[PDB]
């Protein structure tokens, strides 16, 4: 939303509408899976895997 509120500036009554359209849309290209694509995250795991990872911490 910070991104959308900035890169988009008009709605008299309800803006909340067009907003959550740019938001829900932009989300698709800022999600975890995409980040994982460029290795900005080590992985996007199945939350049941949380333990197996933490375990390697000790």
């Amino acid at each position: 939303e910070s991104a959308v509120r900035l890169g988009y500036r008009t709605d008299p009554a309800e803006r909340q509408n067009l907003f959550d359209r740019l938001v829900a849309a932009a989300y698709q290209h800022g999600k975890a899976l995409r980040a994982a694509t460029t290795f900005e995250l080590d992985d996007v795991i199945d939350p049941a895997a949380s333990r197996a990872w933490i375990t390697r911490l000790s």
């Binding site: 500036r9 008009t10 709605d11 008299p12």
Partner: protein, 428 residues
């Protein structure tokens, strides 16, 4: 008598207070959501409502249920919500509870904009085709109770509600400034005639559109209104008490209200009522300016809260230190109402500004700066502005948006002998 206040926020708290002075037992209700509003702790009993948020307060079954378990005699809808809903009114009567408002059919007649305009014409009042020129919003406060077997309606005062942003009121003024005692008398006489003609019982605000010496009926509100406060400051009256007195069965004559133009269910008689001084009500909302001079509701915890407080300064609030402000409801935070004796409009404005400057809020954005800048406007210095004024000056005004210092011994502070802008300072 037992009173159930079917509303929330400041108006609920307002009603609870007059009810307490009168000695009634009060019962408040709150959406699971509105748990910490001040009106809850203020009442004698507070039953929780099923739903959550605004739409919770519309649960007719729920309220009637609360009223049944607490044995509440009367039910006050406040304003907004069920206040003008005929079905609820009838449902209360049905359940054998007194609905503090007009009759069920009156709410149907007035609730219907088309039907009302017809009633209007019928009682000899000019109306819109729909799109008037240079107009002012003038409202006439009416009180209507039965005397003998007829309905008497008295015009207790009038207000200027022109200052509005996209149709939401920001500043109400009482009395309306600069109205020929010809036009005034014309508005009071129209209001009480229209009110008595439709058999109203209780409070009602007749709205008008004024342009020069010409005016036209706009709408009627058979409920208590947010700006009822400036009428109280200039009249002396406690309009809520009157509302209740009427609800309890009191008659026009035994209400002992100040003199004024009235309609004794026959012909109109009297001189315009007396409105001592001038009063201004400023709606301080928890909201801020967006990009395109847009309006974004605010939200946050009131870390610091301290409203203006002096002689002639009244604050009907809903906020308090600690309260977390939510955008889930009306953004009104407090109603600062200043009044001044005499007629110096300029003095009245000064006071409104000061009151605002002494209003300390922290942790939530308010419109105090906006209101504050909107008061500086030179046009307003003539006593009033039209309906388009606030909407046109919005961009220009939106664009326009002491701390204890210890002194070690041997030091003295050079203070500003008067208010102003710095232009030059010396080297540390």
């Amino acid at each position: 008598a037992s009173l159930l206040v079917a509303n929330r926020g400041e108006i609920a708290l307002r009603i609870i207070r007059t009810a307490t002075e009168l000695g009634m037992r009060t019962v408040a209700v709150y959406a699971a959501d509105d748990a910490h509003s001040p009106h809850v702790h203020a009442a004698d009993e507070a039953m929780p409502l099923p739903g959550s948020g605004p739409p919770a307060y519309l649960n007719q079954a729920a309220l009637l249920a609360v009223a049944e378990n607490t044995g509440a005699t009367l039910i006050h809808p406040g304003y907004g919500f069920l206040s003008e809903n005929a079905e609820f009114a009838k449902a209360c009567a049905a359940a054998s509870h007194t609905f503090v408002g007009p009759d069920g059919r009156v709410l149907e007649l007035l609730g219907n904009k088309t039907a009302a305009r017809r009633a209007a014409i019928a009682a000899g009042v000019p109306t819109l085709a729909a799109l008037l020129g240079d107009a002012r919003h003038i409202e006439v406060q009416v009180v209507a109770a039965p005397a003998g077997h007829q309905t008497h309606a008295l015009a207790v005062g009038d207000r200027d509600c022109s200052m509005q942003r996209r149709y939401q009121k920001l500043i109400e003024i009482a009395p309306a400034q600069g109205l020929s005692e010809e036009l005034r008398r014309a508005l009071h006489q129209a209001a009480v005639r229209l009110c008595a003609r439709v058999g109203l019982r209780g409070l009602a605000t007749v709205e008008f559109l004024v342009s020069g010496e010409r005016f036209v009926f706009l709408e009627v509100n058979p409920r208590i209104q947010v700006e009822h406060t400036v009428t109280e400051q200039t009249t002396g009256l406690d309009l809520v008490a009157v509302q209740l007195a009427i609800a309890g069965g009191e008659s026009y004559y035994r209400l002992g209200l100040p003199a004024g133009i009235a309609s004794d269910g026959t012909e109109v008689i009297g001189e315009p009522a007396a409105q001592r001084g001038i009063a201004i009500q400023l709606r301080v909302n928890a909201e801020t300016f967006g990009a395109d001079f847009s309006v974004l509701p605010s939200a946050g915890t009131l870390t610091a809260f301290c409203p203006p407080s002096g002689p002639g300064v009244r604050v009907d609030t809903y906020g308090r230190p600690g309260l977390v402000v939510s955008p889930q409801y009306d953004s009104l935070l407090a109603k600062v109402i200043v009044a001044v004796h005499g007629s110096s409009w300029r003095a009245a404005m000064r006071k409104a500004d000061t009151a605002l400057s002494e209003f300390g809020v922290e942790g939530v954005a308010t419109n105090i700066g906006f209101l504050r800048r909107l008061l500086a406007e030179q046009r307003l210095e003539t006593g009033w502005v039209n309906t388009d004024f606030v909407d046109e000056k919005l961009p220009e005004l939106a664009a326009a948006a002491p701390g204890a210092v210890e002194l070690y011994p041997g030091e003295d502070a050079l203070r500003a002998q008067l208010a102003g802008t710095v232009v030059e300072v010396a080297p540390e």
